[PDB]
Design a protein around this ligand. Structure first.
Ligand SMILES: NC(=O)C1=CN([C@@H]2O[C@H](COP(=O)(O)OP(=O)(O)OC[C@H]3O[C@@H](n4cnc5c(N)ncnc54)[C@H](OP(=O)(O)O)[C@@H]3O)[C@@H](O)[C@H]2O)C=CC1
Ligand SMILES: NC(=O)C1=CN([C@@H]2O[C@H](COP(=O)(O)OP(=O)(O)OC[C@H]3O[C@@H](n4cnc5c(N)ncnc54)[C@H](OP(=O)(O)O)[C@@H]3O)[C@@H](O)[C@H]2O)C=CC1
Ligand SMILES: CC(=O)[C@@H](O)[C@H](O)COP(=O)(O)O
Ligand SMILES: CC(=O)[C@@H](O)[C@H](O)COP(=O)(O)O
Lengths: 398, 398
């Protein structure tokens, strides 16, 4: 029996995680739930799973949650704020922490779980992207184990040998017969959209992913392929891969979730339904398996599986992420921050869909900070880039 | 340094095996080569790899080989016959034996390697099919290591967890999170051929496999899908799988080589170029990897990947194989024997392509013999089936 804290319980990943728990009450128990502002969902989750604690980051949301749960006779203690989220991630009683807060806001609570030596079920890719080597070193220095939840990285993990799996981030790919890591793939909802129509796409259009039901931020990132850029960076840290050991491949059906090339010509892959309960359950049970609620993939009802080279002209954000990573951590931290601001602006109908990539570039051109030496420096670059991004958004205020 | 005996060196698998040796001369050396009657090829292989011994089954071929080797200055010594092949498989200095003789003729030399405790690179599926549990038990009692070379079984092996890999044939699939084994798939050269045009198909037409360049016997088996039937039986022994843990899937492109379903919905697969050097190299180097000479799979050049359920009515041999396995080992041994006789008669233009399945069923219906309790019994059932099959072929003589 393993006890769990879920960071970001009310969102897409959080709810999928709770469904895996629902299917396996003998194996998993929720001790703490952490979220932002969705009180309605958090009340529902607390009444079902009777967590010891529930945390809302937003102070006013926490007040409402405390009152509502008290009237319902809940035993759950309600806390509030960022520090309480960190406290939950570090509960001495907890074995696993689902890191599923969106954006760099998840970094401090995720780092707290790492310092406490927990098993980190890493969905929140922005935390690793923005923190980089400092993140990976903290996992090694403490007793922590990273298990990749993100679909592609989970697929790659499943398709790697045990010496790599058991020394994630530091083992040598070539010594284990790996030639490269093949990161797929979808292209998003606008893959075939005429280029001239991109400027007038709405938030609802951008968030209708053809294959995955996800949160709004990552759905927009999938439409620009900034998501694939962030995942490229994530893969390089997780699997200790160089630029020459990474391939990006478009696969519009999202059945093959990613692959690994070996020296003898073999390519190992993970396939399945586009359902995050599968990778979540992989990480929660590893090295064993559990029922996730996902049924067997029916190969007789599939679309034909196709592949293609990335259309870099169409998706400037992909190349931007790759070049930021080349430049260094300051540029990468700045780019992630800029993208959080521009995506949020687009969702709030302040800028156009095509302004995301342009404003992201504009922020990078205006920033030239030194490489972070500690987590405080990562946060300074992040904060600075957010401010630059807010000013660029306001310049396009209609 | 690993020293090899290759059973069936001059054939399709044998030549691919020697190309892996050619690419890795610091890792592999050939001690003995065993073949049938292809003297010309054996001469070339002896001159290049300088084996201590060469064995031809054909006594006239051994005579010719000796003369040619002595004329051309080779120090390779020549023997002949089945017993000599068994002796080559059990040499002290031999580490690995490539079992790549076609048909049940490979059984005794393969069993000799097993009893000597060698690493068995098993390509010769008919030996396991015809001997079944007695084969798997011999491996267990002698502490030989079985590594599947057959493309599909190698792909499944690569897609299974370590506890199954390290206890092949005796570990529990369910305890290791496996739901089923997915066996693909091609359908053969007559997949789209109208049923009424099969009667006039020539040996060359049946042997023209759309995806794999192989020996003539297995190529005809792929045309009737008897090969997939034999592979179904092979898979159930190797991976300790029940009928409900097996799935057969048509996959015309032969890019996905086979797959494994897990409890959480995950499907693991191996893909690659349709080139046997890949799986051969995988077994030769295991648990490490080597360059096999096979180029990396170009996903952008691939045809769309498709899947379909088997058409058992078009392919009565596939159904007959699955039925014979449920009936027991006597029926399975008899069917394999019958099919060796009918395929050979078809290749020699004694019977029609459509006579293969018809005569195979006829032989099984006339066969009533006891379950083999030992290898001698397997040989008696096999010999009896061949008699019945030969009689049936002779009745169709023009
Ligand atoms: N959804 C998916 O299929 C995949 C998601 N991911 C990653 O997982 C992470 C979560 O994404 P997703 O679930 O889609 O996003 P959602 O918007 O659906 O959920 C985000 C969660 O984070 C919470 N949250 C936001 N800010 C804070 C804060 N500062 N403190 C505590 N909690 C906070 C939200 O609370 P609330 O809603 O109550 O305000 C919500 O529970 C992202 O990093 C994403 O990249 C990766 C692969 C796939
Ligand atoms: N080719 C492929 O892609 C695959 C093959 N296999 C299996 O591997 C085995 C070999 O197949 P393949 O290479 O295609 O067949 P081939 O016809 O190309 O080769 C058969 C080999 O066996 C030799 N041989 C035949 N009879 C005897 C005998 N009685 N004693 C010693 N050697 C003998 C042949 O000698 P010679 O030619 O000199 O007469 C030849 O070297 C088969 O069991 C097949 O099912 C499995 C998966 C794939
Ligand atoms: C489900 C998941 O892990 C997403 O990160 C996925 O990458 C989205 O699809 P795209 O490939 O279109 O970004
Ligand atoms: C390469 C190999 O292992 C063959 O056995 C393969 O199975 C032949 O193709 P079919 O799938 O058409 O039988």
């Amino acid at each position: 029996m393993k006890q769990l804290t879920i960071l970001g319980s009310t969102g897409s990943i959080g709810c999928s995680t709770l469904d895996v728990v629902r299917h396996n009450p003998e194996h998993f128990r929720v001790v703490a739930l952490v979220a932002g502002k969705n009180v309605t969902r958090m009340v529902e989750q607390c009444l079902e799973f009777s967590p010891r604690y529930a945390v809302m980051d937003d102070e006013a949301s926490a007040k409402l949650l405390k009152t509502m749960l008290q009237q319902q006779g809940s035993r759950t203690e309600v806390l509030s704020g960022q520090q309480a989220a960190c406290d939950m991630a570090a509960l001495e009683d907890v074995d696993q922490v689902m890191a599923a807060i969106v954006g760099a806001a998840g970094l401090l609570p995720t780092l707290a779980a790492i310092r406490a030596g927990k098993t980190i079920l890493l969905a929140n890719k922005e935390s690793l992207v923005t923190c980089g080597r400092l993140f990976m070193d903290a996992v090694k220095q403490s007793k922590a184990q990273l298990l990749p939840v993100d679909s592609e990285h989970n697929a790659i993990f499943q398709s790697l040998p045990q010496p790599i799996q058991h020394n994630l981030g530091y083992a040598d790919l070539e010594q284990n017969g790996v030639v490269s890591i093949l990161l797929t793939g979808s292209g998003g909802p606008f893959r075939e959209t005429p280029l001239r129509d991109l400027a007038t796409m709405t938030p609802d259009q951008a968030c209708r992913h053809p294959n995955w039901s996800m949160g709004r931020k990552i759905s927009v990132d999938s439409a620009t392929m900034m998501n694939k850029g962030l995942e490229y960076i994530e893969a390089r840290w997780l699997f200790n891969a160089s630029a020459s050991q990474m391939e990006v491949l478009i696969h519009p059906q999202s059945v093959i979730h990613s692959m690994v090339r070996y020296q003898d010509g073999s390519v190992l892959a993970q396939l399945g339904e586009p359902d995050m309960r599968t990778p979540i359950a992989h990480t929660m049970a590893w090295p064993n398996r559990v029922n996730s609620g996902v049924k067997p993939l029916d190969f007789c009802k599939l679309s034909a599986l196709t592949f293609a080279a990335p259309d870099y002209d169409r998706y400037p954000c992909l190349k931007l992420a790759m070049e930021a990573f080349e430049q260094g951590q300051a540029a990468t931290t700045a780019l992630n921050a800029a993208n959080e601001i521009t995506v949020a602006a687009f969702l709030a109908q302040q800028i156009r869909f095509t302004d995301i990539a342009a404003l992201n570039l504009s922020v990078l051109e205006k920033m030239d900070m030194r490489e972070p030496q500690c987590v405080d420096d990562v946060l300074s670059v992040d904060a600075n880039a957010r401010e630059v991004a807010r000013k660029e958004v306001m310049r396009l205020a209609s």
